[PDB]
Amino acid sequence: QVRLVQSGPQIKTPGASVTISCGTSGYDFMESLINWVRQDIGKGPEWMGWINPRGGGVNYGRRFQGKVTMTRDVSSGTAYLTLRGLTSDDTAKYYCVRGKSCCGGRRYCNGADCFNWDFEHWGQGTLVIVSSASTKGPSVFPLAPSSKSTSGGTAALGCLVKDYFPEPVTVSWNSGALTSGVHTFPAVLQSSGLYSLSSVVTVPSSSLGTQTYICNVNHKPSNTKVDKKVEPKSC
Amino acid sequence: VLTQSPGTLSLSPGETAIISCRTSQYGSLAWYQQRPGQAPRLVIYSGSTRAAGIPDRFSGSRWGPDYTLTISNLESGDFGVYYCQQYEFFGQGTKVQVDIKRTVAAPSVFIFPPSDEQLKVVCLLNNFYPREAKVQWKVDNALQSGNSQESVTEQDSKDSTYSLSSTLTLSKADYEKHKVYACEVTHQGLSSPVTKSFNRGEC
Amino acid sequence: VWKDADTTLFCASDAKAHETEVHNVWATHACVPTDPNPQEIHLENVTENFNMWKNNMVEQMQEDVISLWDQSLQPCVKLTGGSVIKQACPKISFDPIPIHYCTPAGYVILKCNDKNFNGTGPCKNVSSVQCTHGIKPVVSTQLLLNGSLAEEEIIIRSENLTNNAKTIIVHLNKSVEINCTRPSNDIRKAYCEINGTKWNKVLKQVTEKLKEHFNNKTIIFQPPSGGDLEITMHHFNCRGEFFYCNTTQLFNNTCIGKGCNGTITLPCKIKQIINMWQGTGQAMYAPPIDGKINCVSNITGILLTRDGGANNTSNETFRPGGGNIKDNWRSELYKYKVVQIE
Ligand SMILES: *[C@@H]1O[C@H](CO)[C@@H](O)[C@H](O)[C@H]1NC(C)=O
Ligand SMILES: *[C@@H]1O[C@H](CO)[C@@H](O)[C@H](O)[C@H]1NC(C)=O
Ligand SMILES: *[C@@H]1O[C@H](CO)[C@@H](O)[C@H](O)[C@H]1NC(C)=O
Ligand SMILES: *[C@@H]1O[C@H](CO)[C@@H](O)[C@H](O)[C@H]1NC(C)=O
Ligand SMILES: *[C@@H]1O[C@H](CO)[C@@H](O)[C@H](O)[C@H]1NC(C)=O
Ligand SMILES: *[C@@H]1O[C@H](CO)[C@@H](O)[C@H](O)[C@H]1NC(C)=O
Ligand SMILES: *[C@@H]1O[C@H](CO)[C@@H](O)[C@H](O)[C@H]1NC(C)=O
Ligand SMILES: *[C@@H]1O[C@H](CO)[C@@H](O)[C@H](O)[C@H]1NC(C)=O
Ligand SMILES: *[C@@H]1O[C@H](CO)[C@@H](O)[C@H](O)[C@H]1NC(C)=O
Ligand SMILES: *[C@@H]1O[C@H](CO)[C@@H](O)[C@H](O)[C@H]1NC(C)=O
Ligand SMILES: *[C@@H]1O[C@H](CO)[C@@H](O)[C@H](O)[C@H]1NC(C)=O
């Protein structure tokens, strides 16, 4: 049982500072070096630096010099990473990692004695977004179906959500009654700095003017649940 | 210091994926696996030593400077991007793409105008195959780009189908500007490229 | 006929039975007298592999020095693992003495006599001895003090220089004195003096060696990027007092590209609150004694870390480090290993 538990995701303004934690348990926190890695999807993983829990010794990559500080709390057995002067380039997901152990039950061990690079243990990661503004509230309009009931086929309906953060958002239909033919598309990010997903569902033709459809959109951090009604509109 | 190749492998269950990685330096190498949205997972370390809980299908090998990772009998659990790693150096990445024995299909013609209204345009491609698809926007009977992002639900589970959501975003003075919002859909299992119908002020 | 082996060693020393000094007291009860006529046999046409980074003699000395400090340098207050320990904290007499490590019956110590031996690999001039040379158990960071010097060229030791996570040990071939003093009558104010001419000459020779290992890239020294004061500063114990010294001035690149060839004086501070090198908690001691506190030592080594990165610049940067006290012992025991007879 060697778990690395990182803190939650968060958005920040261009210039602020982020301090993300890395909870450790199931191993003597003092015997392993702790690394930090940055992954921006669109590119690959990048090693940022390691810190020795013993003395507090750090090795910052030259690319991250002055933008990165790594501390520790020997009491709780926790590593930390604070980011200074945030820019849009700092928009990435950040992992805390350590390699395989080599101590094997010795009483006096140091993380610098093991190999460290055989990264076996990763955290779940932490999203850090540097874009202007914060907000959090959601907003959604109904998707319009056809305009005339099709002879004997199936129509398409849904509701498109915009401006929401963080992830994820749960979207159901008819309070969970309708589940067939449903497609809730994954989260796409605009250049603004927030999210906007889409949800659709395939239903029979002669069911438009009859059965009502209510899509339930929910995201917990800003505490908001929505009940929207879709219907063929003014024509 | 590290050069991984190729960038993308479009392969299928049963086939054997080959991922190479040439190094300027040399020494101990590890191979990682990143399932979409998840943290990387150590697969091979110290060159050829298989990590704990890794099936026999994965194995590491060397011949000179070009390190290789061969994966026998692919499955959808092997989908994702892989990286090689010397110490603190990682490779560019090889995006291995899983596939399904599904032959071909045809997407579903659907478009929707904005609500009534949000101003206080989405093109749907339902249950097609393969993952490869094309989407355009012909507002003003003219091309549009940069303002449209697309989402794709990975292959379905019953009929193994893909679905696409093309979202064309505009502004308060660009909707009422033109009288046309076309989205054409081209696909492998299609005949001739044909658009739908739209029109504002009328439905 | 032998094989590499581990066993519990014993220690020998010239501790004085009439001394109250803490290293002497410890050694009188824990070590035996030395041999005035020690035997050493050189083995003709014999080659051995050594690995200083995996030498259990190092682990055993660490256990010993910890035991010494645990019995002696007890603090007024000890904060460890959430508990608070208060006890008497009298001033003591403190001055490290040389300790020999020796094998019991059925075992012996092989010694590498290759002058330029880096600590890992084959050795062509091997001898057997019962005891190591006399090692003073000096605890310090950044700078190695009162140790043994390299017999020929300056030597760089690392398990793998290419691996930035491994600490680098620089073994000097010429000593540089460091003179630290707290003048008689701010009771915590001190300073260390270093010959700038000798030091800048010697550090550069170290740079030339580093160039030999790093394909003639530019070698740059920089201050520590972070951590506890015990690591970011040159820390050591002088006459029972814990000194913390700023070494910023020691690694200045400018003077060997002028007007530097003078005396270098580093600002120091005596600290009452310390992070124990034993790795446990925090310790509180009484204020420094009165009068002139002076320790003159030889700098005989340097501990460095090379910056990591995805870089490909024309410079390699090294910063003073340490904090793993095992490295101190490694620097002295590197030429020794235990083997089992029969
Ligand atoms: C050091 O690294 C080199 C190359 O990276 C490798 O060939 C060698 O085996 C390593 N040696 C040790 C002792 O780690
Ligand atoms: C090496 O030692 C052997 C004795 O075992 C001796 O006979 C031989 O001459 C030596 N080799 C050289 C080159 O001196
Ligand atoms: C080998 O050791 C002997 C005696 O200890 C010494 O005279 C000789 O110079 C050494 N050889 C080398 C190459 O250091
Ligand atoms: C320091 O070096 C001098 C000569 O280099 C030597 O006489 C003295 O014993 C050394 N002091 C130590 C090792 O404590
Ligand atoms: C120390 O070694 C350097 C080279 O590393 C050499 O130039 C110098 O002469 C040596 N000093 C001695 C042997 O006193
Ligand atoms: C030490 O010497 C051995 C034997 O030549 C060599 O393989 C190794 O790379 C050297 N290590 C260093 C740090 O110089
Ligand atoms: C050390 O420095 C003090 C104060 O500057 C001085 O009195 C003393 O003579 C120095 N010691 C030596 C050996 O030069
Ligand atoms: C300082 O070093 C210079 C130049 O090497 C030398 O002339 C002088 O004796 C040194 N000072 C001391 C106190 O050793
Ligand atoms: C050492 O002294 C310099 C002098 O300017 C200072 O900038 C630096 O912060 C000091 N470092 C420590 C660790 O006290
Ligand atoms: C290094 O030498 C230069 C040239 O005299 C000097 O200006 C600089 O302050 C020195 N670095 C220090 C004292 O840290
Ligand atoms: C080094 O040795 C001298 C005398 O040999 C002593 O006064 C000094 O305190 C020693 N240094 C340390 C750090 O123990």
Tab-separated table of C-alpha atoms in Angstrom, chain C:
chain	number	residue	atom	x	y	z
C	1	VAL	CA	41.145	-17.547	-0.579
C	2	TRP	CA	38.268	-15.227	0.287
C	3	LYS	CA	34.875	-13.681	-0.567
C	4	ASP	CA	33.139	-10.339	0.088
C	5	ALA	CA	31.332	-10.501	3.441
C	6	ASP	CA	29.602	-8.575	6.225
C	7	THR	CA	30.167	-8.808	10.012
C	8	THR	CA	30.026	-6.652	13.085
C	9	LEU	CA	33.256	-4.684	13.325
C	10	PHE	CA	34.857	-3.327	16.454
C	11	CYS	CA	36.700	-0.059	17.000
C	12	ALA	CA	40.115	0.865	18.324
C	13	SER	CA	41.446	4.222	19.485
C	14	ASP	CA	43.947	6.167	21.587
C	15	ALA	CA	41.277	7.665	23.844
C	16	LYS	CA	42.560	9.184	27.080
C	17	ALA	CA	41.159	7.686	30.271
C	18	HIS	CA	41.639	10.970	32.131
C	19	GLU	CA	39.747	13.040	29.571
C	20	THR	CA	36.242	14.395	30.052
C	21	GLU	CA	36.134	15.128	26.307
C	22	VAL	CA	33.153	13.356	24.809
C	23	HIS	CA	34.814	11.400	21.993
C	24	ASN	CA	37.393	10.109	24.475
C	25	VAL	CA	34.771	9.022	27.017
C	26	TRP	CA	32.739	7.182	24.384
C	27	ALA	CA	35.821	5.448	22.956
C	28	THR	CA	37.178	4.375	26.370
C	29	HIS	CA	34.100	2.192	26.853
C	30	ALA	CA	33.312	1.234	23.249
C	31	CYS	CA	36.740	0.754	21.625
C	32	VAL	CA	39.988	-1.088	22.407
C	33	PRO	CA	43.604	0.157	22.392
C	34	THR	CA	45.368	0.404	19.011
C	35	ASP	CA	48.221	-1.827	17.797
C	36	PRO	CA	51.595	-0.046	17.827
C	37	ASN	CA	52.934	-2.503	15.228
C	38	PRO	CA	50.022	-3.218	12.832
C	39	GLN	CA	50.727	-5.794	10.099
C	40	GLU	CA	49.927	-5.137	6.429
C	41	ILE	CA	50.562	-7.616	3.619
C	42	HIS	CA	50.650	-6.498	-0.004
C	43	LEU	CA	49.207	-9.083	-2.362
C	44	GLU	CA	51.375	-9.486	-5.540
C	45	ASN	CA	49.622	-9.583	-8.946
C	46	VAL	CA	46.182	-9.307	-7.337
C	47	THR	CA	43.142	-7.341	-8.691
C	48	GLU	CA	39.874	-6.550	-6.711
C	49	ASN	CA	36.705	-4.687	-7.503
C	50	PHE	CA	35.566	-2.184	-4.879
C	51	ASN	CA	32.306	-0.313	-4.545
C	52	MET	CA	32.396	2.531	-2.047
C	53	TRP	CA	28.686	3.175	-2.547
C	54	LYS	CA	27.822	-0.274	-1.271
C	55	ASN	CA	30.145	-0.816	1.651
C	56	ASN	CA	28.439	-1.839	4.876
C	57	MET	CA	31.358	-0.448	6.876
C	58	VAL	CA	29.755	2.899	6.059
C	59	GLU	CA	26.405	1.840	7.515
C	60	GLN	CA	28.095	0.612	10.700
C	61	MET	CA	30.043	3.839	11.313
C	62	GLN	CA	26.834	5.826	10.893
C	63	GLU	CA	25.167	3.681	13.565
C	64	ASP	CA	28.170	4.307	15.828
C	65	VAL	CA	28.295	8.100	15.465
C	66	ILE	CA	24.531	8.321	16.042
C	67	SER	CA	24.978	6.319	19.244
C	68	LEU	CA	27.774	8.663	20.324
C	69	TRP	CA	25.655	11.776	19.737
C	70	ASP	CA	22.574	10.223	21.383
C	71	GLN	CA	24.490	9.547	24.605
C	72	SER	CA	26.438	12.800	24.674
C	73	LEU	CA	25.120	15.951	22.980
C	74	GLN	CA	21.775	15.728	24.748
C	75	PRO	CA	19.806	19.009	24.409
C	76	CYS	CA	17.778	21.011	26.905
C	77	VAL	CA	14.678	20.155	24.858
C	78	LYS	CA	14.034	17.450	22.250
C	79	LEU	CA	11.038	17.622	19.921
C	80	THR	CA	10.655	14.284	18.148
C	81	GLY	CA	7.598	12.530	16.735
C	82	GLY	CA	5.152	14.761	18.581
C	83	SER	CA	6.666	14.326	22.038
C	84	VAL	CA	8.541	16.832	24.208
C	85	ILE	CA	11.629	15.791	26.154
C	86	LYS	CA	13.246	18.130	28.708
C	87	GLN	CA	16.513	17.222	30.337
C	88	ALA	CA	19.720	18.674	31.697
C	89	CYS	CA	21.911	20.312	29.091
C	90	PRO	CA	25.351	21.089	30.613
C	91	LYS	CA	28.170	22.529	28.498
C	92	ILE	CA	30.601	19.832	27.359
C	93	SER	CA	34.128	19.275	26.080
C	94	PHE	CA	33.935	18.309	22.419
C	95	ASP	CA	36.712	17.440	19.970
C	96	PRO	CA	36.603	14.421	17.606
C	97	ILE	CA	39.318	11.770	17.851
C	98	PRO	CA	40.482	9.249	15.220
C	99	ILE	CA	38.639	5.914	15.244
C	100	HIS	CA	39.922	2.711	13.648
C	101	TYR	CA	37.518	0.086	12.304
C	102	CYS	CA	38.726	-3.478	12.639
C	103	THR	CA	37.595	-6.976	11.649
C	104	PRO	CA	37.025	-9.863	14.091
C	105	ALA	CA	38.668	-13.293	13.783
C	106	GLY	CA	38.121	-15.122	10.503
C	107	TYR	CA	37.792	-11.863	8.593
C	108	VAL	CA	40.146	-9.241	7.148
C	109	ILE	CA	40.065	-5.834	5.414
C	110	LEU	CA	41.309	-5.394	1.856
C	111	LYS	CA	42.741	-1.972	1.057
C	112	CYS	CA	43.059	-0.442	-2.403
C	113	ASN	CA	46.416	1.295	-2.827
C	114	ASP	CA	45.817	2.568	-6.370
C	115	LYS	CA	46.654	6.277	-6.081
C	116	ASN	CA	44.024	7.501	-8.552
C	117	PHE	CA	41.363	4.976	-7.541
C	118	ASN	CA	37.918	6.562	-7.895
C	119	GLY	CA	36.206	4.232	-5.427
C	120	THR	CA	34.544	1.848	-7.887
C	121	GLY	CA	36.139	-0.823	-10.056
C	122	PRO	CA	39.291	-2.954	-10.180
C	123	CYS	CA	42.315	-2.254	-7.990
C	124	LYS	CA	45.786	-3.607	-8.893
C	125	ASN	CA	47.659	-2.828	-5.637
C	126	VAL	CA	45.753	-4.549	-2.898
C	127	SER	CA	46.834	-5.125	0.685
C	128	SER	CA	45.271	-6.742	3.726
C	129	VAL	CA	45.008	-5.082	7.136
C	130	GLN	CA	43.275	-5.671	10.460
C	131	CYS	CA	42.230	-2.056	10.927
C	132	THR	CA	41.486	1.042	8.856
C	133	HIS	CA	43.435	4.274	9.313
C	134	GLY	CA	42.294	6.592	12.115
C	135	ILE	CA	39.068	8.340	11.152
C	136	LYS	CA	37.694	11.325	13.079
C	137	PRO	CA	33.872	11.133	13.078
C	138	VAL	CA	33.388	14.729	11.956
C	139	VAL	CA	29.787	15.637	11.170
C	140	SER	CA	29.472	18.459	8.644
C	141	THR	CA	27.789	19.636	5.449
C	142	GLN	CA	29.067	21.192	2.191
C	143	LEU	CA	32.732	20.993	3.222
C	144	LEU	CA	34.585	17.930	4.479
C	145	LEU	CA	36.797	18.835	7.437
C	146	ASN	CA	39.918	17.307	8.979
C	147	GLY	CA	39.818	14.345	6.604
C	148	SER	CA	42.500	12.585	4.571
C	149	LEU	CA	43.851	14.060	1.329
C	150	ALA	CA	44.168	12.492	-2.127
C	151	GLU	CA	47.766	11.412	-2.747
C	152	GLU	CA	48.008	12.590	-6.370
C	153	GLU	CA	45.392	14.414	-8.444
C	154	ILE	CA	42.065	15.721	-7.151
C	155	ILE	CA	39.489	12.941	-7.377
C	156	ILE	CA	35.796	13.169	-8.238
C	157	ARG	CA	33.668	10.387	-6.787
C	158	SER	CA	30.085	9.555	-7.782
C	159	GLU	CA	28.149	6.315	-8.240
C	160	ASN	CA	27.170	7.766	-11.615
C	161	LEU	CA	28.014	11.365	-12.580
C	162	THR	CA	25.432	11.217	-15.377
C	163	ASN	CA	22.715	10.542	-12.762
C	164	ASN	CA	21.910	13.930	-11.166
C	165	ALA	CA	20.284	12.342	-8.097
C	166	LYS	CA	23.597	10.932	-6.851
C	167	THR	CA	25.772	13.137	-4.625
C	168	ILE	CA	29.257	14.036	-5.895
C	169	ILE	CA	32.289	13.792	-3.598
C	170	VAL	CA	35.294	15.954	-4.476
C	171	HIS	CA	38.515	14.643	-2.924
C	172	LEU	CA	41.126	17.398	-2.692
C	173	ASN	CA	44.847	16.691	-3.035
C	174	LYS	CA	45.944	19.816	-1.180
C	175	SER	CA	44.413	21.042	2.090
C	176	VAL	CA	42.845	24.464	2.534
C	177	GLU	CA	42.569	25.739	6.113
C	178	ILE	CA	39.365	27.264	7.462
C	179	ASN	CA	39.585	29.424	10.580
C	180	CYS	CA	36.297	30.038	12.362
C	181	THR	CA	36.043	32.251	15.459
C	182	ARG	CA	33.524	33.759	17.870
C	183	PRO	CA	35.454	36.766	19.271
C	184	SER	CA	35.400	37.454	23.034
C	185	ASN	CA	32.242	39.577	23.507
C	186	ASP	CA	26.088	39.456	20.103
C	187	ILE	CA	27.126	36.117	21.601
C	188	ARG	CA	26.041	34.228	18.469
C	189	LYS	CA	28.145	36.257	16.005
C	190	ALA	CA	31.028	34.408	14.336
C	191	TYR	CA	33.028	34.256	11.086
C	192	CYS	CA	35.219	31.835	9.110
C	193	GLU	CA	38.426	32.864	7.309
C	194	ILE	CA	39.711	31.180	4.133
C	195	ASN	CA	42.751	31.860	2.030
C	196	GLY	CA	41.319	33.147	-1.227
C	197	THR	CA	44.512	32.545	-3.211
C	198	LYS	CA	44.799	28.906	-2.126
C	199	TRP	CA	41.103	28.211	-2.348
C	200	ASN	CA	40.494	29.762	-5.743
C	201	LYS	CA	43.525	27.906	-7.127
C	202	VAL	CA	42.278	24.583	-5.738
C	203	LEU	CA	38.603	24.914	-6.727
C	204	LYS	CA	39.623	25.545	-10.351
C	205	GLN	CA	41.744	22.412	-10.410
C	206	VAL	CA	38.518	20.693	-9.346
C	207	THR	CA	36.802	22.419	-12.313
C	208	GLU	CA	39.434	21.054	-14.703
C	209	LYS	CA	38.667	17.562	-13.433
C	210	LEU	CA	34.949	18.140	-13.885
C	211	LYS	CA	35.642	19.279	-17.461
C	212	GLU	CA	37.371	15.930	-18.042
C	213	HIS	CA	34.190	14.113	-17.040
C	214	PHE	CA	31.725	16.399	-18.809
C	215	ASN	CA	33.203	16.639	-22.304
C	216	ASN	CA	34.876	19.990	-21.616
C	217	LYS	CA	31.580	21.763	-20.901
C	218	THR	CA	31.740	24.983	-18.869
C	219	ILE	CA	31.742	24.345	-15.123
C	220	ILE	CA	29.749	26.771	-12.963
C	221	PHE	CA	29.261	26.819	-9.204
C	222	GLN	CA	26.035	28.179	-7.733
C	223	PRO	CA	24.522	28.452	-4.237
C	224	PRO	CA	22.014	25.818	-2.986
C	225	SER	CA	18.520	26.159	-4.452
C	226	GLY	CA	16.810	25.367	-1.166
C	227	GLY	CA	16.311	23.224	1.913
C	228	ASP	CA	16.992	23.334	5.641
C	229	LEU	CA	19.704	25.638	6.978
C	230	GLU	CA	21.850	22.622	7.859
C	231	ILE	CA	22.203	21.893	4.126
C	232	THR	CA	22.087	25.367	2.513
C	233	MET	CA	24.814	26.523	4.896
C	234	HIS	CA	28.101	24.925	5.921
C	235	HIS	CA	27.086	23.387	9.219
C	236	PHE	CA	29.375	21.741	11.767
C	237	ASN	CA	29.960	21.493	15.492
C	238	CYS	CA	32.795	23.486	17.118
C	239	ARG	CA	33.644	23.014	20.790
C	240	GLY	CA	30.072	21.826	21.376
C	241	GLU	CA	28.476	24.762	19.560
C	242	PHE	CA	26.549	24.372	16.293
C	243	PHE	CA	27.938	26.695	13.623
C	244	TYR	CA	26.032	27.689	10.481
C	245	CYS	CA	28.140	29.370	7.797
C	246	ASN	CA	27.216	31.077	4.529
C	247	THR	CA	29.401	29.730	1.709
C	248	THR	CA	28.080	32.038	-1.046
C	249	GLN	CA	31.456	33.788	-1.224
C	250	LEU	CA	33.355	30.529	-1.610
C	251	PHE	CA	32.047	29.652	-5.051
C	252	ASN	CA	32.440	32.913	-7.021
C	253	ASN	CA	33.078	32.289	-10.756
C	254	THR	CA	34.296	35.854	-11.434
C	255	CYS	CA	37.785	35.694	-9.912
C	256	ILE	CA	39.075	33.139	-12.395
C	257	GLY	CA	38.068	34.586	-15.723
C	258	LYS	CA	40.239	40.127	-10.492
C	259	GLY	CA	41.409	41.480	-7.148
C	260	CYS	CA	40.130	38.362	-5.420
C	261	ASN	CA	43.381	36.795	-4.330
C	262	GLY	CA	42.884	37.957	-0.737
C	263	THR	CA	41.354	36.688	2.509
C	264	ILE	CA	37.736	35.461	2.319
C	265	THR	CA	35.627	35.964	5.467
C	266	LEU	CA	32.292	34.108	5.696
C	267	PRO	CA	29.563	35.280	8.094
C	268	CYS	CA	28.464	32.567	10.534
C	269	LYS	CA	25.919	32.113	13.305
C	270	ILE	CA	25.747	29.857	16.347
C	271	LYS	CA	22.303	28.304	16.511
C	272	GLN	CA	20.514	27.030	19.588
C	273	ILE	CA	17.714	25.418	17.599
C	274	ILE	CA	18.919	22.622	15.326
C	275	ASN	CA	17.509	19.999	12.985
C	276	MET	CA	19.183	16.814	14.176
C	277	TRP	CA	21.274	15.060	11.500
C	278	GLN	CA	20.027	11.892	13.179
C	279	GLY	CA	16.799	12.576	11.287
C	280	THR	CA	14.449	12.608	14.244
C	281	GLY	CA	13.284	16.074	15.261
C	282	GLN	CA	14.371	19.466	16.537
C	283	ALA	CA	16.771	20.035	19.444
C	284	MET	CA	17.287	22.983	21.788
C	285	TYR	CA	20.585	23.791	23.466
C	286	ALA	CA	21.772	26.450	25.919
C	287	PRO	CA	23.321	29.750	24.737
C	288	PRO	CA	26.992	29.635	23.602
C	289	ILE	CA	29.756	29.676	26.215
C	290	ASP	CA	31.641	32.888	26.943
C	291	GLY	CA	35.024	33.838	25.509
C	292	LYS	CA	36.851	33.061	22.281
C	293	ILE	CA	35.468	30.011	20.485
C	294	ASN	CA	37.948	28.961	17.800
C	295	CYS	CA	38.302	25.910	15.543
C	296	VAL	CA	40.957	25.703	12.831
C	297	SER	CA	40.288	22.862	10.398
C	298	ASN	CA	41.511	21.535	7.056
C	299	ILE	CA	39.032	21.494	4.207
C	300	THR	CA	39.773	18.172	2.512
C	301	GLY	CA	36.651	17.608	0.438
C	302	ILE	CA	33.575	19.112	-1.190
C	303	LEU	CA	30.063	17.733	-1.610
C	304	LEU	CA	28.312	18.763	-4.823
C	305	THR	CA	25.071	18.220	-6.711
C	306	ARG	CA	24.804	18.852	-10.452
C	307	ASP	CA	21.618	20.467	-11.757
C	308	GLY	CA	19.102	18.227	-13.498
C	309	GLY	CA	17.222	19.105	-16.656
C	310	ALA	CA	16.155	18.413	-20.236
C	311	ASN	CA	18.829	20.945	-21.058
C	312	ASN	CA	21.621	20.978	-23.616
C	313	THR	CA	23.427	24.178	-22.717
C	314	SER	CA	27.198	24.598	-22.708
C	315	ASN	CA	27.372	24.791	-18.936
C	316	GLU	CA	27.075	22.281	-16.123
C	317	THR	CA	26.135	23.749	-12.778
C	318	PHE	CA	27.184	22.371	-9.433
C	319	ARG	CA	25.918	23.462	-6.038
C	320	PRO	CA	27.172	22.510	-2.586
C	321	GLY	CA	25.062	19.880	-0.870
C	322	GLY	CA	25.137	16.967	1.525
C	323	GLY	CA	22.842	16.167	4.418
C	324	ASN	CA	23.357	12.460	3.977
C	325	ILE	CA	26.023	12.044	6.660
C	326	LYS	CA	26.786	8.582	5.244
C	327	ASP	CA	28.683	10.358	2.480
C	328	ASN	CA	31.143	11.726	5.037
C	329	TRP	CA	32.047	8.208	6.108
C	330	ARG	CA	32.085	7.037	2.484
C	331	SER	CA	34.789	9.604	1.711
C	332	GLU	CA	37.165	7.953	4.188
C	333	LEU	CA	36.209	4.278	3.889
C	334	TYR	CA	36.121	4.177	0.087
C	335	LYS	CA	39.383	2.229	-0.190
C	336	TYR	CA	38.358	-0.502	2.257
C	337	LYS	CA	36.144	-3.581	2.087
C	338	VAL	CA	35.552	-6.583	4.352
C	339	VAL	CA	36.089	-10.157	3.127
C	340	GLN	CA	35.622	-13.530	4.842
C	341	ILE	CA	38.503	-15.959	5.330
C	342	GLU	CA	37.422	-19.572	4.639
